[PDB]
Amino acid sequence: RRKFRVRNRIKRTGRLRLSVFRSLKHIYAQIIDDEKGVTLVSASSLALKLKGNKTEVARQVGRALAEKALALGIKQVAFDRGPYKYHGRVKALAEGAREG
Amino acid sequence: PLDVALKRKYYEEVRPELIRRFGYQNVWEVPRLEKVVINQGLGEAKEDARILEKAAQELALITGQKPAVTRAKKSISNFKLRKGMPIGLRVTLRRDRMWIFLEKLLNVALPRIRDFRGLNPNSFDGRGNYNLGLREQLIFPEITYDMVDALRGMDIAVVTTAETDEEARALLELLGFPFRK
Amino acid sequence: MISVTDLRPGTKVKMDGGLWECVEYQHQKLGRGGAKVVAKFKNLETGATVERTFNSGEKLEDIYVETRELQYLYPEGEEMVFMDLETYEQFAVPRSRVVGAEFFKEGMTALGDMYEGQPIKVTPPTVVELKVVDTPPGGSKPATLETGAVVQVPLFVEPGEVIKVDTRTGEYVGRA
Amino acid sequence: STRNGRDSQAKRLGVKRYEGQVVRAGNILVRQRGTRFKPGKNVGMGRDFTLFALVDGVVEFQDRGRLGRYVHVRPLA
Amino acid sequence: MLMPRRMKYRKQQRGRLKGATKGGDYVAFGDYGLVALEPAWITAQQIEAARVAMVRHFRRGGKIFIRIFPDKPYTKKPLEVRMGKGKGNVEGYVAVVKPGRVMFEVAGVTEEQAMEALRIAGHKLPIKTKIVRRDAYD
Amino acid sequence: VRIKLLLECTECKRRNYATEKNKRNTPNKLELRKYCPWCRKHTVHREV
Amino acid sequence: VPARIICGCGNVIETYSTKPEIYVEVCSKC
RNA sequence: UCCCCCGUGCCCAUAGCGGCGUGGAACCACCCGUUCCCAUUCCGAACACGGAAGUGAAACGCGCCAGCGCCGAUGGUACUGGGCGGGCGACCGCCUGGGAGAGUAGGUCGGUGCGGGGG
RNA sequence: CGCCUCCUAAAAGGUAACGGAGGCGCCCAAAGGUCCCCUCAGGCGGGACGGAAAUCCGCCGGAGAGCGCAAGGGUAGAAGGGGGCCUGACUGCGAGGCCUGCAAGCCGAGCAGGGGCGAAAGCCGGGCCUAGUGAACCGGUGGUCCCGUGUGGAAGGGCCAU
RNA sequence: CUGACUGGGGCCUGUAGAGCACUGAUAGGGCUAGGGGGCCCACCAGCCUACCAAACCCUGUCAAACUCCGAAGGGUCCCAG
RNA sequence: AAAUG
RNA sequence: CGCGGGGUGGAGCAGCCUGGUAGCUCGUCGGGCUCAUAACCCGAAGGUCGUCGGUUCAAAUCCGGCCCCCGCAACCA
Ligand SMILES: [Mg+2]
Ligand SMILES: [Mg+2]
Ligand SMILES: [Mg+2]
Ligand SMILES: [Mg+2]
Ligand SMILES: [Mg+2]
Ligand SMILES: [Mg+2]
Ligand SMILES: [Mg+2]
Ligand SMILES: [Mg+2]
Ligand SMILES: [Mg+2]
Ligand SMILES: [Mg+2]
Ligand SMILES: [Mg+2]
Ligand SMILES: [Mg+2]
Ligand SMILES: [Mg+2]
Ligand SMILES: [Mg+2]
Ligand SMILES: [Mg+2]
Ligand SMILES: [Mg+2]
Ligand SMILES: [Mg+2]
Ligand SMILES: [Mg+2]
Ligand SMILES: [Mg+2]
Ligand SMILES: [Mg+2]
Ligand SMILES: [Mg+2]
Ligand SMILES: [Mg+2]
Ligand SMILES: [Mg+2]
Ligand SMILES: [Mg+2]
Ligand SMILES: [Mg+2]
Ligand SMILES: [Mg+2]
Ligand SMILES: [Mg+2]
Ligand SMILES: [Mg+2]
Ligand SMILES: [Mg+2]
Ligand SMILES: [Mg+2]
Ligand SMILES: [Mg+2]
Ligand SMILES: [Mg+2]
Ligand SMILES: [Mg+2]
Ligand SMILES: [Mg+2]
Ligand SMILES: [Mg+2]
Ligand SMILES: [Mg+2]
Ligand SMILES: [Mg+2]
Ligand SMILES: [Mg+2]
Ligand SMILES: [Mg+2]
Ligand SMILES: [Mg+2]
Ligand SMILES: [Mg+2]
Ligand SMILES: [Mg+2]
Ligand SMILES: [Mg+2]
Ligand SMILES: [Mg+2]
Ligand SMILES: [Mg+2]
Numbered sequence A: 001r002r003k004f005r006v007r008n009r010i011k012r013t014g015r016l017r018l019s020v021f022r023s024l025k026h027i028y029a030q031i032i033d034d035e036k037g038v039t040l041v042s043a044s045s046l047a048l049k050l051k052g053n054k055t056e057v058a059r060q061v062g063r064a065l066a067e068k069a070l071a072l073g074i075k076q077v078a079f080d081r082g083p084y085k086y087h088g089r090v091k092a093l094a095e096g097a098r099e100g
Numbered sequence B: 001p002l003d004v005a006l007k008r009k010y011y012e013e014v015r016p017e018l019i020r021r022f023g024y025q026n027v028w029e030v031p032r033l034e035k036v037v038i039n040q041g042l043g044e045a046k047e048d049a050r051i052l053e054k055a056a057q058e059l060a061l062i063t064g065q066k067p068a069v070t071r072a073k074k075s076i077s078n079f080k081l082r083k084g085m086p087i088g089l090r091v092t093l094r095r096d097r098m099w100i101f102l103e104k105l106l107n108v109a110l111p112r113i114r115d116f117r118g119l120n121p122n123s124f125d126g127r128g129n130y131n132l133g134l135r136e137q138l139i140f141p142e143i144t145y146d147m148v149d150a151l152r153g154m155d156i157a158v159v160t161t162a163e164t165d166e167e168a169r170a171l172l173e174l175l176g177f178p179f180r181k
Numbered sequence C: 001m002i003s004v005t006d007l008r009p010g011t012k013v014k015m016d017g018g019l020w021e022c023v024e025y026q027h028q029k030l031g032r033g034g035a036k037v038v039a040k041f042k043n044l045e046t047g048a049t050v051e052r053t054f055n056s057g058e059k060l061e062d063i064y065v066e067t068r069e070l071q072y073l074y075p076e077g078e079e080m081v082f083m084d085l086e087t088y089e090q091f092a093v094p095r096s097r098v099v100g101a102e103f104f105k106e107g108m109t110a111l112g113d114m115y116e117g118q119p120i121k122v123t124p125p126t127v128v129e130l131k132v133v134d135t136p137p138g139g140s141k142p143a144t145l146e147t148g149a150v151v152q153v154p155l156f157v158e159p160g161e162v163i164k165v166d167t168r169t170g171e172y173v174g175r176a
Numbered sequence D: 001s002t003r004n005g006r007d008s009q010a011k012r013l014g015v016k017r018y019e020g021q022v023v024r025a026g027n028i029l030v031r032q033r034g035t036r037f038k039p040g041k042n043v044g045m046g047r048d049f050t051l052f053a054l055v056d057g058v059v060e061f062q063d064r065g066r067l068g069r070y071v072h073v074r075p076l077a
Numbered sequence E: 001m002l003m004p005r006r007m008k009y010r011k012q013q014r015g016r017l018k019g020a021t022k023g024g025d026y027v028a029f030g031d032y033g034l035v036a037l038e039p040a041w042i043t044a045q046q047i048e049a050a051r052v053a054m055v056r057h058f059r060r061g062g063k064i065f066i067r068i069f070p071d072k073p074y075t076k077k078p079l080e081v082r083m084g085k086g087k088g089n090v091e092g093y094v095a096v097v098k099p100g101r102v103m104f105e106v107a108g109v110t111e112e113q114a115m116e117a118l119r120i121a122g123h124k125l126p127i128k129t130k131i132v133r134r135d136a137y138d
Numbered sequence F: 001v002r003i004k005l006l007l008e009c010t011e012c013k014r015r016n017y018a019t020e021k022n023k024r025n026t027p028n029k030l031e032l033r034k035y036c037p038w039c040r041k042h043t044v045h046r047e048v
Numbered sequence G: 001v002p003a004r005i006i007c008g009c010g011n012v013i014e015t016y017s018t019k020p021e022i023y024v025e026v027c028s029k030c
Numbered sequence H: 001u002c003c004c005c006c007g008u009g010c011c012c013a014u015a016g017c018g019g020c021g022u023g024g025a026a027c028c029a030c031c032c033g034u035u036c037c038c039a040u041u042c043c044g045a046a047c048a049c050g051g052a053a054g055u056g057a058a059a060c061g062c063g064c065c066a067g068c069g070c071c072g073a074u075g076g077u078a079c080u081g082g083g084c085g086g087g088c089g090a091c092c093g094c095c096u097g098g099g100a101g102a103g104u105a106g107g108u109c110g111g112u113g114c115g116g117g118g119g
Numbered sequence I: 001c002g003c004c005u006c007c008u009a010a011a012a013g014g015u016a017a018c019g020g021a022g023g024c025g026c027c028c029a030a031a032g033g034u035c036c037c038c039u040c041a042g043g044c045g046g047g048a049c050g051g052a053a054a055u056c057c058g059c060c061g062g063a064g065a066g067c068g069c070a071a072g073g074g075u076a077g078a079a080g081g082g083g084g085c086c087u088g089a090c091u092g093c094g095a096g097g098c099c100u101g102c103a104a105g106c107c108g109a110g111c112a113g114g115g116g117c118g119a120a121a122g123c124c125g126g127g128c129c130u131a132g133u134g135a136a137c138c139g140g141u142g143g144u145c146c147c148g149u150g151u152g153g154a155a156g157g158g159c160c161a162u
Numbered sequence J: 001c002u003g004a005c006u007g008g009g010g011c012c013u014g015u016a017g018a019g020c021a022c023u024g025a026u027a028g029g030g031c032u033a034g035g036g037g038g039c040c041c042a043c044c045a046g047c048c049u050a051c052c053a054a055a056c057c058c059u060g061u062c063a064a065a066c067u068c069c070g071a072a073g074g075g076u077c078c079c080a081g
Numbered sequence K: 001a002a003a004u005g
Numbered sequence L: 001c002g003c004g005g006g007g008u009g010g011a012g013c014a015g016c017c018u019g020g021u022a023g024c025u026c027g028u029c030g031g032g033c034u035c036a037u038a039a040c041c042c043g044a045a046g047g048u049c050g051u052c053g054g055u056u057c058a059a060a061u062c063c064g065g066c067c068c069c070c071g072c073a074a075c076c077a
Helices: A055-070 B005-022 B054-059 B095-109 B165-175 E044-057 E111-123
Strands: A017-022 A027-033 A038-041 B033-040 B089-093 B129-134 B154-160 C024-028 C036-040 C052-055 C069-071 C079-083 C090-094 C109-115 C119-123 C128-131 C141-144 C150-153 C162-166 C171-175 D028-031 D043-045 D051-053 D057-063 D069-075 E032-036 E040-043 E064-066 E072-076 E089-097 E102-106 E129-132 G002-004 G014-016
Touching: A027 A055, A038 A055, B005 B095, B005 B165, B033 B054, B033 B095, B054 B089, B089 B095, B095 G014, B129 B165, B154 B165, C069 C079, C090 C119, C150 C162, C150 C171, D028 D069, D043 D069, E032 E111, E040 E044, E040 E072, E044 E064, E044 E089, E044 E102, E044 E111, E102 E111, E111 E129
Parallel strands: none
Antiparallel strands: A017 A027, A027 A038, B033 B089, B033 B154, B129 B154, C024 C036, C036 C052, C069 C109, C079 C090, C109 C119, C128 C162, C141 C150, C162 C171, D028 D051, D043 D051, D057 D069, E032 E102, E032 E129, E040 E089, E064 E102, E072 E089, G002 G014
């Protein structure tokens, strides 16, 4: 009675999640701060228009979330995405000293 | 190969009927084919070194998809072989592999089956899917009598997005499935 | 070192440097004295027996003489070799410790009393199949079996004919 | 002449620091076999399922419905 | 003879027969019942004799309802042994009864007969009893 | 146990040990793995 | 690869599988 | 702020099963492809990439209905901390404080924070 | 007759009896790390040989499956199943606690060295957890260089390890 | 001045009681495999049965080692006497 | 060698 | 009331620790040798493994409760 378990998150112990979403056409990503239930930083894909590769599009929204982030105190986070499978769509964005 | 004799027939000869037949509204909503499975129990992973791969390169020789070697889940004293590895062979057909298969089956296969007076009409039942068995494996073209040390029956299960039997029935029927009627 | 009050027929133990196996055991506590254990034993290799008695205390010294099933392979020297159809180890048993080593067969399955990985008793089954390769087509005549041993058999039993022979009496118990 | 008369030396299980009690980093807060209680904020648990403080603070027992029961430790703020 | 066909444990402790009656204090199956006035352990030995003199009185008649069942083991060390060495052997089973429980109830039989049969059934039980009707039970 | 057996590990030509427990019969017939020696750091390690 | 079904009951079948050299001694003619 | 949607967390079934009905502009999905990254003990089913003809049928969001599920009093009992009586026991009752579980009346086909997109 | 589990045990802990009822003296080089995947038992159909469960397909099924072994607590938002690399079944340490008459037994964050897995966050100083055990003495094996009966060196000890 | 004891809060619990949701126990009834018997040739099914009887379904109950529930109390920390 | 009716 | 061992083809015994195997002798029925019967020779059939539970993938076997079985004890007063 549950398709995919996900919970690669849930295994989130170290504050500040880089919650990602793999939409068929776009990609959104927010820097959520649980233990507060508040989202501190966003930066979506086509909800900002941007290019037309998909992955090269991710790269962008990545650098877009980082820059935005930094200038807020952020600089250290933890990646995520449920079925993240951490592949293709990866946004190994510059800035954001969260490493990896 | 993206298209076949039967595939077309489905789209431009069956698609129409069913709609006109049960009167569907949405495009999708009308019976399509999901997948057709063909497995073999063999149960012959006993002594003498049960290679029985020939049956795997063959199952797939007529399919074009190396099969997946299933194993026993539990373990049974009663009929030797138990706990693991032993027997099991099965391949899942989808898309074009699905079509270029059913064709032969329906055109050349089912035809030569000892007696075969159609396909038992009860094997549906509540199943928006169908099931049927074969004794031989030479019923197919890609394989001849000579090359095949031993016999090898198998089960063929066609899954359908159909919810009813009539829906399933008609479809496989407009496709070419003969019927013990 | 198990005591006696804790024996049971079948228990194997080491007494007088030898190997036995309690086959009779009866706790005895008459009068108000201390209890006593009165048993009867059997050597594992020789048949010799010996009933004895012990007090409640006295410990004995259990042994581990389990009986796996071995298997004949081939002769060699004045010995013959078997194998535990289990762990396939190799045992070179000296003709003496192989009961009815003759009337056997290079390939037959028999039994051995493994005592520290070395059989001290190798018995075949009460009767085994063997091909007589001798005897005059001439009644109760002698017949050399494939294992070189000779046995008394009836008439009809002629060269090449495989028969049965009780490995305890080496007597013809019928044909194959 | 019986066949019983055995048992095992009691083990003294259970919560060993209740809600609102001040601890120090290290204090084992709970001793238990299964996971009757689960780790929380600043509350790692051990091999034997023994929850223990991770920082000097207080203990809180969050009951999470069908999600189980938690024991956190809100450090001294 | 009327003892569980199976059990998870053979010997069971004794407990204590306080008041109340967890349940079964109203008829529900018949015309006249046989409520128990005091606590006790009814032995299968008994129940039978009650069910028996019952049928026998109104030979070939209505049906009987046995709303109590002997499931509690009863121990009794061998005769003339001193204390110790374990909990004695089992010898039958009891059925725990507290004031109020309706042990019996019949029907299909007239009211004239009921009062008599049950009146008898009571002289077969170790406790005091009272025969009831059937009314504000619904 | 017997089929079990105790054993340690030697740094390859020298001292130190780990002392684990092989298991005869089953995966046995010798066995070595990688482990850290009191001296210097990490190497293979054989039984004996 | 495509193929050809050369029965005996006339009727040839152009499709796909392996080895377009098929002597289907009996197509759908019964 | 106000609704529609997408994310995410919280309460933890008054949030569910089952029916019935809805939405495709946008979203989201199925969907269309499999050259590429990555792929299935055999299947692009699933993961993955490139796309957008079509659809909202599936799945999901939102409604509605209460058959099932879950929630559930107020009354009154059980039992009981402390005090005190009764029988020969059997066990039963009185006072003062706490007070269930069943059962009944009834209740619910969710409430909800933060960030995004949208009129 | 020691150890584990359940009850008795009276809703903290603890608690007796020749009270009720069962287990252990082991085991895994994968049944251990880590990373990524997968979800069960049963039930109704449906199917060649095929029991009543061999293998396959469809629903229905929150856990009744499983978790090497007793029972218990635990657990599918894995502790279960599968696969790839690996060996942290690390060495120097160990704040702070549990339990406790002593002796023991148990948990343990963090630091150093040097590694394994992971993109990373991190995780790893055995095993879902409670049994699988034995103080000192006396000796044995390696190591070490500490003492080495006037000196040097041995003899013999010591320390670490087993 | 922290004590025994008490007041107010917070946590931990699975007993009395009660309750069948699991573990099993269980009276009758229903529906129903399964056996027993009769209808009858073996064409192997079809049917009936004031019998023995699984599942499930109600209606009734039982349990130290059962618990969907569950008090009174008890334990401990905190602040006060 | 080899019993009995 | 305990103490240990035993219930396997018709009879008497193996097999049980070391779970996957029914072993033996006599008997029985069939067939030969004899005029015939023995003997003798040829060949065959036959075991819910005392029952009721549990453990296991599986049990005669391992585990428990009963039922019969055989033998041993019951002392100081
Ligand atoms: Mg004791
Ligand atoms: Mg005791
Ligand atoms: Mg105790
Ligand atoms: Mg205990
Ligand atoms: Mg009595
Ligand atoms: Mg006495
Ligand atoms: Mg009234
Ligand atoms: Mg619509
Ligand atoms: Mg390309
Ligand atoms: Mg590749
Ligand atoms: Mg839809
Ligand atoms: Mg209520
Ligand atoms: Mg009230
Ligand atoms: Mg009182
Ligand atoms: Mg209430
Ligand atoms: Mg001790
Ligand atoms: Mg308790
Ligand atoms: Mg207690
Ligand atoms: Mg299933
Ligand atoms: Mg089936
Ligand atoms: Mg089968
Ligand atoms: Mg089947
Ligand atoms: Mg099944
Ligand atoms: Mg691995
Ligand atoms: Mg320390
Ligand atoms: Mg310390
Ligand atoms: Mg100490
Ligand atoms: Mg362990
Ligand atoms: Mg593991
Ligand atoms: Mg000394
Ligand atoms: Mg020494
Ligand atoms: Mg030395
Ligand atoms: Mg010196
Ligand atoms: Mg001197
Ligand atoms: Mg000198
Ligand atoms: Mg000197
Ligand atoms: Mg010199
Ligand atoms: Mg030295
Ligand atoms: Mg003061
Ligand atoms: Mg009670
Ligand atoms: Mg209780
Ligand atoms: Mg208490
Ligand atoms: Mg308090
Ligand atoms: Mg004060
Ligand atoms: Mg005869």
